[PDB]
Amino acid sequence: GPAVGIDLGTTYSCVGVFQHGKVEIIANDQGNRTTPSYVAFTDTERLIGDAAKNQVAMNPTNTVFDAKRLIGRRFDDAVVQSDMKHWPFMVVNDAGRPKVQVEYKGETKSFYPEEVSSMVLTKMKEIAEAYLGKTVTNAVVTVPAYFNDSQRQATKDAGTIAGLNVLRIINEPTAAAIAYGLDKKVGAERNVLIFDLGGGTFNVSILTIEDGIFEVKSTAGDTHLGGEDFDNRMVNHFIAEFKRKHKKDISENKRAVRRLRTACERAKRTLSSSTQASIEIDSLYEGIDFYTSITRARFEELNADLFRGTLDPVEKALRDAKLDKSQIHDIVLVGGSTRIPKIQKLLQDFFNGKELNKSINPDEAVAYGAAVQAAILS
Numbered sequence: 001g002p003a004v005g006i007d008l009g010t011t012y013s014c015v016g017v018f019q020h021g022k023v024e025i026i027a028n029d030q031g032n033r034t035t036p037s038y039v040a041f042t043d044t045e046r047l048i049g050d051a052a053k054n055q056v057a058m059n060p061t062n063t064v065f066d067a068k069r070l071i072g073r074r075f076d077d078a079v080v081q082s083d084m085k086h087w088p089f090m091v092v093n094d095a096g097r098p099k100v101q102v103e104y105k106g107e108t109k110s111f112y113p114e115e116v117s118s119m120v121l122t123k124m125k126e127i128a129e130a131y132l133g134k135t136v137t138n139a140v141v142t143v144p145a146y147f148n149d150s151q152r153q154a155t156k157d158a159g160t161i162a163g164l165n166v167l168r169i170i171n172e173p174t175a176a177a178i179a180y181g182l183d184k185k186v187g188a189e190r191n192v193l194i195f196d197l198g199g200g201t202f203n204v205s206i207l208t209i210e211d212g213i214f215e216v217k218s219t220a221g222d223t224h225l226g227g228e229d230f231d232n233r234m235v236n237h238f239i240a241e242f243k244r245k246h247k248k249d250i251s252e253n254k255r256a257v258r259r260l261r262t263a264c265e266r267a268k269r270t271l272s273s274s275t276q277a278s279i280e281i282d283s284l285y286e287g288i289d290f291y292t293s294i295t296r297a298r299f300e301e302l303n304a305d306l307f308r309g310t311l312d313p314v315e316k317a318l319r320d321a322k323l324d325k326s327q328i329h330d331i332v333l334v335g336g337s338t339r340i341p342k343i344q345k346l347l348q349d350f351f352n353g354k355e356l357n358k359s360i361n362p363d364e365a366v367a368y369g370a371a372v373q374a375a376i377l378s
């Protein structure tokens, strides 16, 4: 079986495979090229991926996500302490290590973060196998550039327990560069800027590549900024609209909100190609059908400050790396949020018209690069 490339992401994961000089990003059962990093436990089963995320509104306490934020970390970790204040599931201490606690088939069960991730990993593995029509064993898994050795270890472990022989763990930005071929030797130093705006995390990385060797000269971003924050803004906006229109506040009804959010995220994706999208929700609150729409202009207006602030981490990355806009040779877009027009304009304007690398789907770039790296490693 060919070695595969796996992007084990915070909110979305992707698997690609190099074959006949071409990289193929493998779609899942539902036909999507990326699958949510969600795991849900019920009375009768364990749901992973889309099936899992498609019921989080119904089974909040038993639907686990954000496992990547826990992996390789300690319970006493300030990150963990701050984080768990927002997850609808339990995180318990176990001799220092944190564990997620769920109820599976009536009985209480706990899992180490690496076990949750191995579940997502097994899902990607069978997606690959379903496509290849053969067993996948070897793999290259990606990790953020800021991951310490514990976090890398845990990611490796998640692989082993998922039945995957992890050939190598490579940084996500480096995987993005390899996807565009920016790793080929041109007898000169090259500075690449990776602008990664995903589902819930934002990362900016400046790589220096000479002789084919990478050198992460600097990094920046925000671990709590992503496409989900843009969704929230739409939600708050629509909650206020429903109120004016029906003098009812649906805030308390978690289900109404969760369904509205799902409609928003979808409208958001449509907004990246169309100037407006309709929000059609049957029986949102009580028996009131919420039928409305948003325009790209209003969308951009709701997230203006968020979008604009995206440039601060870019300026920081520059000054830390000791470079000026003029010195960065290539800029590659990574993450599903970079498909947003305003974000592309804004970044280009900042780099005074410089062309942006974006021919490869941004949310598939890391997988793409890992698959290539897997191919050379085997």
Ligand SMILES: Nc1ncnc2c1ncn2[C@@H]1O[C@H](COP(=O)(O)OP(=O)(O)O)[C@@H](O)[C@H]1O
Residues within 6 Å of the ligand: 009, 010, 011, 012, 013, 034, 197, 198, 199, 200, 201, 226, 227, 228, 265, 268, 269, 270, 272, 334, 335, 336, 337, 338, 339, 340, 362, 363
């Ligand atoms: N067309 C699009 N326009 C805007 N956002 C998009 C689009 N397609 C996907 N996204 C967003 O990308 C995010 C997922 O990004 P992705 O990079 O796949 O995840 P991760 O951050 O987990 O690595 C979600 O917030 C999703 O709404």
Ligand SMILES: [Mg+2]
Residues within 6 Å of the ligand: 009, 010, 198, 335, 366
């Ligand atoms: Mg990502």
